[PDB]
Write a protein that binds this ligand. Sequence first.
Ligand SMILES: [Zn+2]
Length: 143
Amino acid sequence: DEGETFATEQTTQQVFQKLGSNMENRVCFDCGNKNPTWTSVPFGVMLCIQCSAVHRNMGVHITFVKSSTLDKWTINNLRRFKLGGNHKARDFFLKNNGKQLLNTANVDAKTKYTSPVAKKYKIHLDKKVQKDMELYPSELVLN
Ligand SMILES: [Zn+2]
């Protein structure tokens, strides 16, 4: 549980700075609104304020949200964005015949985030996060 301490603001900023270099991470993963600063932590994706409200209403059983710029981030939570982000998520969905779920319109979020491809992705990302916790138990190392 060495990774449950809160990360420093500069580490938090550098994490989201790194994601921000990829264009996929500059648009909301659910609706494509520009410059999302909210997040769905378990899926490691960036969300606009509106979709942060959609996710919040789904319940913690499915997701929970945090602001990249207004909330304190734990080490373990930041890991999901070192290793995740919108580009990694989208690439997994494309490979796992789930491009229909990536549309910015006419997709219900609960269906999106409880689908098989979504559940396999969270497991995929969870393994990467567990490996990172074992190699880097108390600190967030960018490469
Ligand atoms: Zn959105």
